[PDB]
């Protein structure tokens with residue numbers, strides 16, 4: 017849709033003089049405006065999906081940490097010591113990338 | 114991280130204004146013409162593929178004798194300090210190995226024993242003492258509270274080594290200091306060169322005059338002037354030498370290069386037939402392959418060291434049609450030189466043609 | 478994370494330097510579009526007949542003295558078919574510019590029906606005149622809408638006749654696609670289609686006031702098209718200030734300016750008077 | 763030409779185009795983004811703080827597995843809040859970018875229309891087309907992710 021809009025804009029820019037004189041400044045601007053609206057209604061989905069990607073990349077590690085720590089409580093008998101918890105958080109941050 | 118890995122959007126970025134309209138291609142960014150000798154009187158070429166002759170250990174010494182006074186003092190001090198330290202370590206090791214450190218500790222625990230019959234060096238019991246003993250042997254103070262006994266010959270060997278090394282270092286450092294004292298007037302060069310060289314008219318013929326002067330009070334004995342033109346020339350048989358140096362005579366009533374330089378002087382070369390600059394006109398002296406070198410040589414009477422001062426002029430520096438204002442004007446009862454008017458030039462009227470053409474129709 | 482900061486900051490610097498171009502563009506503005514609230518709205522019947530001469534036309538559309546007029550006026554009478562003769566001193570810059578006050582009108586303008594051309598909203602004024610291209614200018618999309626998107630009476634009444642009126646394209650009436658057009662191409666017959674489209678646009682609006690220029694070909698087929706146009710466009714009294722590389726404005730010249738070089742002298746007139754006044758320009762070619 | 767003018771403008775950021783771009787989608791769509799960003803980062807700090815408190819408070823009393831239910835509840839509620847704020851921030855950033863792009867393009871096209879003939883004739887056509895293609899692409903698909911990553 018961007019290429020279509022660019023072709024229309026070049027067509028309304030190259031032949032500019034007759035357009036300005038013939039009182040057709042707005043007649044060949046509305047077509048580009050409509051194509052631009054089409055472009056945004058096509059780009060909204062791209063923005064949605066990229067935001068979803070950012071969200072997942074930021075959120076999956078914290079959920080993994082939550083599950084891996086809550087699991088120990090019920091799974092195991094004894095209390096958890098920092099020398100393992102913090103090592104494991106550093107390991108998760110190493111593994112994410 | 115991975116900025117533009119996706120690489121689809123290209124091949125249709127339209128031409129910029131400077132691209133299509135052709136305003137960018139107006140570069141006008143030519144590199145300057147390569148000089149042969151700089152304005153600062155320093156030749157600047159680039160010799161390459163010279164077979165390296167290695168180095169010699171003599172080069173370190175040659176550098177050592179020629180150093181700034183702010184480095185001679187530092188190397189002086191460092192050499193002496195390092196020598197004292199090295200031999201201090203040797204003396205401390207000798208004391209350790211012979212069993213003198215232990216002996217002194219045991220007989221100073223009950224210090225009433227007071228036994229020092231069998232020790233390599235008396236009263237050396239720690240490393241501080243070894244350092245002080247090495248200081249007293251290298252500098253030859255010799256207080257005598259830490260003697261050298263006749264007990265262990267390794268100590269005598271180290272003593273001989275230390276005396277000889279101290280003598281070597283002392284002799285070398287005195288030699289360096291004396292050499293730097295002998296070269297005490299040898300500072301720098303103070304020959305002043307005019308900045309622009311005019312091409313005036315004098316006695317009906319053109320010239321090529323510049324100005325040269327002194328700053329040092331010491332006279333210059335048997336001064337000599339050489340002037341050369343550097344250009345690429347081709348023989349009729351067609352051999353091209355990229356940089357040919359051709360010598361141009363200097364005007365002098367007895368045809369000699371000897372200049373007597375106390376007050377500033379004007380050095381003229383007259384444009385005759387064989388002159389390289391016979392066929393150059395003022396309108397040609399805008400873009401031209403032309404570099405004129407000037408070399409003045411002599412001996413400063415104080416030091417008696419030969420000095421050579423060079424300079425070079427190109428087409429931009431030459432001021433066709435000017436002359437030099439008189440720097441010298443009499444004071445109340447003594448000649449005077451206003452050195453602020455040294456390189457100042459005045460403008461006068463001279464023919465615009467070349468001497469190539471200025472003597473084919475002389476009555477002009 | 479101590480590396481992402483510098484890298485992303487430099488990238489953002491480059492991109493902001495990119496948006497700076499748009500920020501620069503939005504600042505500039507010119508060519509004021511407004512209406513001076515003319516009395517009675519200057520009804521369309523008034524700026525649809527004849528024309529009015531500009532008193533002391535001193536157009537300053539440059540930094541140097543324009544060759545078109547150096548305090549030089551003109552005599553544009555009702556039906557004063559005009560012409561242009563010369564190469565540089567005579568041009569269509571002032572004519573086209575001041576046709577609808579397009580390029581820097583300074584000292585007066587055309588007071589048609591008592592109301593000036595300048596004191597009119599840009600829209601109506603640009604839609605109440607005409608001009609010729611002197612170059613084929615095509616477009617994309619079907620030829621149905623090119624003439625006008627609301628020409629319901631003429632286009633319906635003349636389905637293929639409106640295009641045919643200036644020049645009868647027979648297979649346009651029965652084409653592969655109903656009023657289909659070849660985008661940005663087909664310039665050969667488009668040379669005449671330019672005249673046909675301009676005539677249609679200015680005829681449905683019933684304007685008839687134009688300023689032509691620089692016929693590129695002037696071929697025999699173009700001559701027949703010109704004859705048809707004269708039957709249609711130049712049949713009305715209001716005629717254009719024709720210009721061309723070859724001097725063919727003297728067939729029905731009435732009131733023009735002889736501008737061989739430097740300035741323009743408003744002296745062109747009927748055949749004998751044109752030859753006497755503009756003998757140099759008519760004898761150059 | 764640098765002239766110590768474009769030189770300084772190269773050594774430092776524009777800082778005024780950036781502010782205009784940031785405040786182009788409105789003013790309540792900006793402080794929302796900063797608010798959500800800061801809250802999410804503070805929460806992500808606080809969850810680690812709480813994890814440290816839980817880990818250190820019961821390091822010694824290994825036989826005594828008491829007070830093992832309050833800590834887990836705190837950790838889980840903090841994790842939920844962090845996940846929600848993460849979900850919020852990306853959507854806010856992309857909404858701001860979308861609105862800013864829309865407004866910029868519409869204003870550019872609505873101000874290019876009222877352009878004098880001297881502007882079009884003097885200015886080469888290639889420059890205008892490059893401005894639309896390059897600036898539209900950069901301001902639509904490139905600035906939001908860069909800004910989000912930087913922040």
Ligand SMILES: CCCCCCCCCCCCCCCCCC(=O)OC[C@H](COP(=O)(O)OC[C@H](N)C(=O)O)OC(=O)CCCCCCCCCCCCCCCCC
Pocket residue numbers: 180181182183184186187190191194300
């Ligand atoms: C591992 C070990 C670590 C070691 C760490 C570093 C140890 C450093 C310790 C000492 C550091 C000293 C450095 C100080 C630098 C100051 C130099 C200062 O003397 O400059 C003064 C000049 C220096 O001329 P130049 O720049 O070298 O150029 C060379 C020459 N002029 C040229 O242009 O070509 O120099 C001169 O011009 C000559 C100076 C002569 C010195 C004076 C001696 C005095 C004798 C005369 C008797 C006077 C009475 C003195 C009594 C004083 C009372 C205490």
Ligand SMILES: COc1ccc(Cl)cc1C(=O)NCCc1ccc(S(=O)(=O)NC(=O)NC2CCCCC2)cc1
Pocket residue numbers: 113114115116
């Ligand atoms: C940064 O990547 C990683 C990060 C993490 C991990 Cl576990 C692996 C990688 C990885 O496998 N990386 C591939 C190697 C790599 C890295 C960085 C970069 S880069 O410097 O960011 N980009 C540029 O250099 N582009 C220039 C300019 C135009 C084209 C020529 C190169 C470029 C290439």
Ligand SMILES: Nc1ncnc2c1ncn2[C@@H]1O[C@H](COP(=O)(O)OP(=O)(O)OP(=O)(O)O)[C@@H](O)[C@H]1O
Pocket residue numbers: 305306307308309452453454455456457
């Ligand atoms: N009064 C002076 N004292 C020391 N050096 C001088 C003096 N006048 C000229 N020079 C030397 O002349 C060289 C060229 O200087 P510069 O081109 O600035 O001016 P100039 O042609 O010498 O004369 P002026 O300074 O009057 O223009 C410099 O290297 C400078 O050292």
Ligand SMILES: [K+]
Pocket residue numbers: 255256257
């Ligand atoms: K003594």
